[PDB]
């Protein structure tokens, strides 16, 4: 009555010790993002997470399975769709966006890690395309307000007087709940690199190529100011570096990281949109099997 198989150890860390380390790793970025926004922004993040998690729980009872809720996939997706919203929306619009984030993009395509794209970007693209006027608000200090990415083209608001570059790190800049606190998001990526959750080969190449496009473009009081602006600090760290979307190969990663700034910065500058860290990762995530096929590691004994 003795258990048997062929390797006998398989010990390092469970996917709960991956995910849960990410759910603890963004906590200084969220606690730094929340106290300007008060309780007002807390309702969208708790109700979007709990709606996302119980929406996966309805699909475990469809075709039968053991519940993966305890692997903590379902919490990370919820905690990232809530980062994309400005705080003044009614809650049901995110709750239907979390139901799209699970039930279509993840559970129709398979289980955890089989989907070809990030759900939070797909639910966000569905959200911003369906009710943009609900998404227009930039609630901080009461009034609707300008954000730096619109004024940097100069094409839009008459009212512009840009915040000083130190003020963005504190989080005083308006816009969405996570992305403004770029220094504590650096504190969370500095924690995540210490656990060897993720290689440098995506964030370093992606931040480097949008810095080259913003430097030859010339657009800012400094070229450096664009890198902390917007969601791009989330998109080099939490978004594109997601296991399931990301390519497996060591060279496949850096082609995906160089080519993400080929498409993001063009929507930032030549494009009419305020930002490109979203609609850019969905195209480069759809490119991945054509990357992963032709880019393979060299075999240890190739002929010739």
């Amino acid at each position: 009555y003795t258990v048997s198989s062929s390797p006998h150890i398989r010990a390092k860390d469970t996917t709960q010790s991956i995910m849960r380390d990410v759910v603890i790793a963004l906590l200084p970025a969220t606690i730094a993002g929340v106290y300007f926004f008060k309780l007002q922004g807390l309702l969208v993040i708790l109700a979007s997470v709990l709606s996302c998690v119980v929406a996966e729980y309805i699909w475990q009872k469809a075709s039968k399975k053991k519940v993966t809720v305890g692997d903590y996939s379902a919490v990370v997706t919820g905690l990232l769709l809530a980062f994309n919203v400005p705080a003044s929306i009614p809650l049901w619009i995110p709750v239907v966006g979390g139901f799209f984030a699970i039930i279509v993009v993840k559970q129709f395509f398979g289980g955890l890690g089989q989907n070809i794209v990030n759900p939070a970007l797909a639910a966000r693209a569905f959200l911003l395309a369906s009710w943009p006027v609900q998404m227009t608000s930039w609630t901080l200090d009461g009034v609707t307000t300008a954000t730096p990415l619109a004024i940097l083209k100069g094409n839009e608001a008459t009212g512009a007087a840009a915040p000083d570059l130190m003020s963005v790190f504190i989080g005083h800049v308006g816009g969405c709940i996570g992305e403004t606190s770029a220094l504590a998001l650096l504190i969370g990526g500095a924690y995540l690199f210490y656990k060897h959750i993720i290689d440098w080969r995506i964030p370093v190449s992606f931040i480097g190529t949008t810095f080259i496009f913003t430097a030859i473009a010339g657009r800012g009081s400094s070229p450096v100011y664009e890198l902390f602006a917007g969601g791009l600090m989330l998109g080099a760290i939490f978004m594109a570096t997601d296991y399931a979307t990301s390519p497996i190969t060591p060279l496949g990663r850096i082609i995906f990281g160089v080519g993400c700034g080929v498409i993001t910065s063009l929507i930032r500058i030549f494009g009419g949109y305020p930002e490109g860290v979203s609609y850019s990762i969905l195209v480069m995530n759809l490119f991945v099997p054509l990357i992963e096929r032709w880019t393979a590691p060299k075999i240890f004994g190739k002929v010739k």
Partner: protein, 435 residues
Amino acid sequence: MELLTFKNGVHPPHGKHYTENKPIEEYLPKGDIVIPMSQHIGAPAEPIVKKGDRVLVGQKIGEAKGFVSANIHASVSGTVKNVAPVTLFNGVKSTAVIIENDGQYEEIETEKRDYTKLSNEEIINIIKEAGIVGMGGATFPTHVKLAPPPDKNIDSIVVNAAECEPYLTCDHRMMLEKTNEIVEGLKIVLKLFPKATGYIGIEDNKMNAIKAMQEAVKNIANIEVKAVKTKYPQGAEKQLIYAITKREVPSGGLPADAGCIVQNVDTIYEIYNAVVNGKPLTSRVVTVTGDAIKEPKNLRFKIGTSVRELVEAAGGFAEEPLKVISGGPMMGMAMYSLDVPSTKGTSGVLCLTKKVAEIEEESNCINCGKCVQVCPMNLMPTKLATASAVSNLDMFNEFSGRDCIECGCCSFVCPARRHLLQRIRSGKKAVSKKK
């Protein structure tokens, strides 16, 4: 010296501190021996022997009916109770000879006590008489291994000294207790081959072992130190050749195509035992280990003792283990039962505790990318293990999954605890079936 390594790998936990600094006590046998003819790779020898004969140490038990088989020898003097068939832990019904110990320890005399005069063809023959297996890993007879067909000229002989595996101290002792003898045999292994210079390849983690060795290598030319970095799987034959002489092994190949022939140190000490001390394989070191055992131990077993009595000699189970292990923790097969006879291909025994041995029913693969990072061969396993389940064999062959060494490293890092290797093993058997 500087610590060379191959490009990719893991750092499995180092369990050796329980066992590393203890004497090799002899185990005198108590219960009856059984000898299974099947222990060498390839087809078993039929025994010559039949029931009720007197038998002795160093008798051949059975002529090797094929090009790749090697002579058996009894561990002990005794009598033939029965040419009984018996299970191995694989569950093949191997032929075997029961030998009750008489307790008397008769041995046939044989001595030589020089190598230097001898013709090299007399060495390959006396090594076919000795019947010696290559001791670690997969278990070739060494007499085919010393004889390439001529066109693949040697450049060198590294030993494969690097005992990468957790909890396996069995080679570290042979280095402390008898370093001349292993360099003596090396000088021998080098008499059969000139042009090829010799190298030791010990890991840095036994720094005390090479620092004992370092005085012995000063007075002679072709042997020299090559310390290596601690990384599983250094003991695989295809990676150590890239590590030292820096040719890459050809795919599908043999070590003679790389011009060098790895050996275990245990084989070295036993080739020295055959050409000089005149005796074959009565014995090998087990390393029994694990916290469920009442003490860590390092027995010299007499071949063909039942494993149950051997672990009871080691102190027995503080609690019942959930996974007794032939061989090392990774590569080795697990026991069907404790009852099985010990065999020359055993190099150690483990008795894992609940604190490790509990795994989980697996989650779906997350596409983490760690398994491509940790394969030494830069094979891309998740497509291969996914290819056996649909049996889409052209994807197995374009990915070159016939190549893989079954190191077990690709299962070891997975957060999902997908266990890939059994799908790799079923696909490697199906490619032998239909190609």
